[PDB]
Design a protein around this ligand. Structure first.
Ligand code: NAG
Lengths: 49, 39
């Protein structure tokens, strides 16, 4: 409770495994990433699907 | 970032020295003086 100002869905929520907010979840969903080499992907390139 | 030969990985939480990538920074600490690669 902060004054009356609703500060839900702008703060981290511990239900999600990542600590991004619901607004931040929307911001990450709308910006469609290219799925670059930040994660390892040679196993995915070898595992042709 | 990738597989890290050399050093080790401790569960201690020190400030970021020489940084490896994706939130991992190495150092040259005592914890037999050697190289560690912590989070
Ligand atoms: C907004 O925040 C207030 C703060 O107490 C909370 O009571 C309310 O349920 C919240 N509403 C939503 C939709 O999250």
């Amino acid at each position: 409770y902060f004054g009356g100002f609703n500060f839900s869905q702008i703060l981290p929520d511990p239900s999600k495994p990542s600590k991004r907010s619901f607004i931040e979840d929307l911001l990450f969903n709308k910006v469609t990433l290219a799925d670059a080499g930040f994660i390892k992907q040679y196993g995915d390139c070898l595992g042709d699907i | 970032a990738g597989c890290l030969i050399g050093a080790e990985y401790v569960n201690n939480s020190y400030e970021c020295d020489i940084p490896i990538g994706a939130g991992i920074c190495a150092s040259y600490q005592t914890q037999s003086q050697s190289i560690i690669a912590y989070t």
